[PDB]
Amino acid sequence: SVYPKALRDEYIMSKTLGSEVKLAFERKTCKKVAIKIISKPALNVETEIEILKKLNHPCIIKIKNFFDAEDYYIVLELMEGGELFDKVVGNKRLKEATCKLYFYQMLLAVQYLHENGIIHRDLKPENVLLSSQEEDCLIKITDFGHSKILETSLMRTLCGTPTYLAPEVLVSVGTAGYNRAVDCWSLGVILFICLSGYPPFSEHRTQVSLKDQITSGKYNFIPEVWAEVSEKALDLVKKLLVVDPKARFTTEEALRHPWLQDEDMKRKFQDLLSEENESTALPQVL
Ligand SMILES: NC(=O)c1ccc(-c2cc(-c3scc4c3OCCO4)cnc2N)cc1
Numbered sequence: 001s002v003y004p005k006a007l008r009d010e011y012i013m014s015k016t017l018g019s020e021v022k023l024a025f026e027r028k029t030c031k032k033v034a035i036k037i038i039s040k041p042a043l044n045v046e047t048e049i050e051i052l053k054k055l056n057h058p059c060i061i062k063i064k065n066f067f068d069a070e071d072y073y074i075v076l077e078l079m080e081g082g083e084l085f086d087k088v089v090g091n092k093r094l095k096e097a098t099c100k101l102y103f104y105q106m107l108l109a110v111q112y113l114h115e116n117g118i119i120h121r122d123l124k125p126e127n128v129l130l131s132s133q134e135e136d137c138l139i140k141i142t143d144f145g146h147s148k149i150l151e152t153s154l155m156r157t158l159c160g161t162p163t164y165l166a167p168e169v170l171v172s173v174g175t176a177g178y179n180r181a182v183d184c185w186s187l188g189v190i191l192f193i194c195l196s197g198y199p200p201f202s203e204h205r206t207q208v209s210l211k212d213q214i215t216s217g218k219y220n221f222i223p224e225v226w227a228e229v230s231e232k233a234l235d236l237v238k239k240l241l242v243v244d245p246k247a248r249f250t251t252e253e254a255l256r257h258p259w260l261q262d263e264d265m266k267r268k269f270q271d272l273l274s275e276e277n278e279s280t281a282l283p284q285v286l
Contacts, residue, residue: 001070004069004070004073007067007069007073009027010028011024011026011035012025017034017082018083021035021037022037023035024075032078033064033076033078034075034078034079035073035075036073037073037074038071038072038073038074039071039072040070040072044145045074045145047144047147048143048144048145049066049074051118051147055112057108057112058276059105059106059108059112059141060113060140061129062077063076064077079130080130080131080133081131081132081137083126083127083130084126084128084139084190085124085125087125087130088125088193088194088197089125091197091198093194093196096230096233098135098136099191099233100233100259100262100265101265101269102128103191104260104269105138105139106139106141107251107254107260109141110141110183110184111251111252111255113141114183114251117149117150119147119148119180119182120146120186121146121147121182121183122186123141123186125190125193127141128142128190129141131272136272138269150180154169154172154173154176158173178245178246181246181248184248184250184251185240187240187251188240189241191236191237192237195229195233197225199220200241201213201219217243232258232259236257236259240254
């Protein structure tokens, strides 16, 4: 098959980056972009586009253009560093200071989403992108297909008498409003993987079921591997891998954790930030 005419009109398509995501060039600027192809569905796409249009944050990918045709085409910022996944697969591990730089950006991004009433719901190494091939770089969150936009139903229900209201609804009031905490769990797992080169929950060399490990919260701790890692880092992971969503660390609490009170790391991030902004900085009023 071929690409839609409206797309071909503005962009020159190119190689596959991930088998789907393609490299392409905007004709007007000769600049590199990334184009995500979603085969026809509608719903996930509708929300993803609507989310990407309204969000504006350095650690969240930006949408440049959209094409609704034989298939869906979403035009995004090209992230040259690729997926974080490819940096941690094959038991590869990142140096702790890099985990801190990356994770700090993940936390800001996800905090920003929660502030804006959005739950990602699919945080994984694959949906985290690096801006460059340098190991010191900006990261951006991607893939909002599974996202949720924020209990209004329950809220309406609590107005008025529960004369006819079922018990399980009232019981659900306790935990109502903590859906965002699933993102913090996911962050916890990502941080674990990054620090250790291996996953906290798997079926490899174990007879307890994946489900069971997770609900129990008994992650596979391998002291050999973790001796390399700080006690501060490990502590943060522990407060994110908390089974009770009400007790689990929020992004704010993670951001205040001692492991993240690291002025050098922050400085380096600011550095990479303004360096990215140089491209677009208009002179301003003194
Ligand atoms: N699942 C998604 O929504 C999504 C969106 C954008 C990207 C993305 C990937 C890349 C990649 S992947 C492997 C690469 C590469 O670029 C450098 C060469 O090697 C680049 N930009 C993107 N926006 C992935 C998934």
